[PDB]
């Protein structure tokens, strides 16, 4: 199923960094011409990737990340950054080195890190 975007038993809040993650990082990446394969969870049935969940045990996508930020799901920007890293790393692990989507992920991840390098201090 889709990853959880809310959890009443997980401590969450909205920090200055987390608002930067929502209003600068996600916004910048979402507008990128390479971002669309990351907008929604990988649908291994629709995409005919029958072994996707054999190889990838912790799926993540930008749609989930954006909803978690909207729900104040995270306690720290660190947690949100790790979700982005999981999303990109999953793509490198599952797909072929020569696939377009790997190149697209590499260009998106570089922008993600550029923006994180300018995140405000907590």
């Amino acid at each position: 199923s889709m990853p959880e975007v809310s959890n009443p038993s997980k401590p969450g809040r909205k920090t200055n960094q987390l608002q930067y993650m929502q209003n600068v990082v996600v916004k910048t990446l979402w507008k990128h011409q390479f971002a669309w394969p990351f907008y929604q969870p990988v649908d291994a049935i629709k995409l005919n990737l029958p072994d996707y969940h054999k190889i990838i045990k912790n799926p993540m996508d930008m749609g989930t990340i954006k909803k978690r930020l909207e729900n104040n799901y995270y306690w720290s920007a660190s947690e949100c950054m790790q979700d982005f890293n999981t999303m990109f790393t999953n793509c490198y692990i599952y797909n072929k080195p020569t696939d377009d989507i790997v190149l697209m992920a590499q260009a998106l991840e570089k922008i993600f890190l550029q923006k994180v390098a300018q995140m405000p201090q907590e």
Binding site: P50, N95, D100
Partner: peptide, 4 residues
């Protein structure tokens, strides 16, 4: 199989 695979993506693209």
């Amino acid at each position: 199989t695979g993506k693209f």
